[PDB]
Amino acid sequence: TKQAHKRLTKEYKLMVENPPPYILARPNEDNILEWHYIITGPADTPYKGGQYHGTLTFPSDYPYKPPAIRMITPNGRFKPNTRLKLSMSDYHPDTWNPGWSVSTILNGLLSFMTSDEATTGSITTSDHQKKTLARNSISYNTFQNVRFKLIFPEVVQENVETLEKRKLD
Amino acid sequence: ATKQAHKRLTKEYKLMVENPPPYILARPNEDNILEWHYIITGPADTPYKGGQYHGTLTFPSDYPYKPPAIRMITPNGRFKPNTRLKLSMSDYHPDTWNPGWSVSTILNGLLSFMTSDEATTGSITTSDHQKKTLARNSISYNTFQNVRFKLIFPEVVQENVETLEKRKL
Amino acid sequence: MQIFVKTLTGKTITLEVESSDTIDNVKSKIQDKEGIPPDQQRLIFAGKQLEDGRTLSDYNIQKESTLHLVLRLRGG
Amino acid sequence: QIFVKTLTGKTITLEVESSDTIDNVKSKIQDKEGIPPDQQRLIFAGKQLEDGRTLSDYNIQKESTLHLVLRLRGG
């Protein structure tokens, strides 16, 4: 659709100019409504050093409804490939501000992932499992994530170089 | 699933393996003879050209005396997903039903009504850009966002991954 | 020439038609071959409904092409 | 006088006191921006803040920069 294409094209430029900290995102070149994000685990969180691939599927009525949020890389916090039930705290739960940027949505997602709140899609693991999946996340996206190789071919090239350096030390 | 329904649907399945109707591939659930799954390939000279549309025919336990419930799962722009579609040969018309009608005729009625523009219960109003957009995204939807498609058509999921990889080359 | 028509019960019949024959003429020939309610059904080719006034040549229906009968309930 | 980076990326200044509650801080943010406090979440050096507390509970020195991230709730 024309309205969402122009808005999401603007969102991408704003994100290219100033990406949100720890978050990279770009739209699928064959579908502007489907964005693919990569979350880098913050230092204080057990997800440190993790490469976390997920999708942001914007509805056809964009920008009037929220997107569907999923996570693909095994991480220990969310069930992979499961739509996350995230709503906006309000008197009416079905409230969506049409003016929230994509960077605002992703920053809120990371802030939720760093917390311990539960929702539809939240899984309960330990901290040793979140650290283990954080270490193997780069390997997963490079070899076991078909959508990662299609959307992020250059990041796959950064991953293979990274893993070779991980053999050192 | 009665003995009479099981014999009929097995014969109807056998007839559709030998002579499948154009653009329509269908087979039942191995664990439920009554739950059939179809794949409509979008015909040419229609905005659905090249689309991969997955749906279901839920036959009642007392088949062949009551009509099945027709649905479509893949976002298509013609029908509301996961909603019972009111078609001539469907559970919306029980009194008109004839047990002698073949399963291929039921699917051809769904396909022909899909490529037309007559309104019915379950149909939606979209533009041509929206129909063609969903036709392009249909393969990616059934491959990664359709669990039932992955369980019923695992080999088509593999063909779809091959199709998408080559398109990204 | 000859064409084929799959009836509602899955049966296949053979019709002797000409490219000039209208879809309505074809439906009438079906009724001659076997008692048919023409107003009650429609013919399909290439996954799309065929209109009565148009010809097989207009629809590019060549020889040995198979047409399919689907039910046409008008009372929604 | 403290600063908080809004969702738009801009930085706004707030007339506050260490005695004032986090909720009142968000009310001033709503007066400035329009985002209601229910839809607000504030971070400071890598940790969030609770509405029932005040500014002194997090020992926030005057003229500090805070990051406003959009809250997101789920059940």
Author numbering:
A (entry chain B): 3 to 171
B (entry chain A): 2 to 170
C (entry chain C): 1 to 76
D (entry chain D000): 2 to 76
Paper text:
Ubiquitin-conjugating enzymes (E2) play a crucial role in the attachment of ubiquitin to proteins. A subfamily of E2s, including yeast Ubc6 and human Ube2J2, also mediates noncanonical modification of serines, but the structural determinants for this chemical versatility remain unknown. A rearrangement of the Ubc6/Ube2J2 active site enhances the reactivity of the E2-Ub thioester, facilitating attack by weaker nucleophiles. Moreover, a conserved histidine in Ubc6/Ube2J2 activates a substrate serine by general base catalysis.
We also determined the structure of a ubiquitin-conjugated form of Ubc6 to 2.6 Å resolution. To stabilize the linkage between ubiquitin and the UBC, we mutated the active site cysteine (Cys87) to Lys, resulting in an isopeptide bond in place of of the native thioester. The asymmetric unit contains two copies of Ubc6-Ub, both adopting so-called “closed” conformations. These conformations are characterized by contacts between a hydrophobic patch centered on Ile44 in ubiquitin and the crossover helix α2 in the UBC domain. The Ubc6 active site is virtually unchanged in one copy of the heterodimer when compared to the ubiquitin-free form. However, in the second copy, there is a drastic conformational change for residues Lys87 to Trp98. The backbone of the C-terminal ubiquitin tail is traceable in the electron density map, but most side chains in this region are not well resolved. The conserved Ser89 forms hydrogen bonds with the backbone amide of Leu73Ub and the carbonyl oxygen of Leu71Ub. Analysis of [15N,1H]-HSQC spectra of Ubc6 coupled via a disulfide bond to 15N-labeled ubiquitin G76C showed chemical shift perturbations (CSPs) typical of closed ubiquitin conformations, confirming that such conformations of Ubc6 are also prominently present in solution. Our X-ray structure of Ubc6-Ub, the structure of Ube2J2, and our MD simulations suggest conformational flexibility in the active site loop, leading to the displacement of the catalytically important histidine residue away from the active site cysteine.
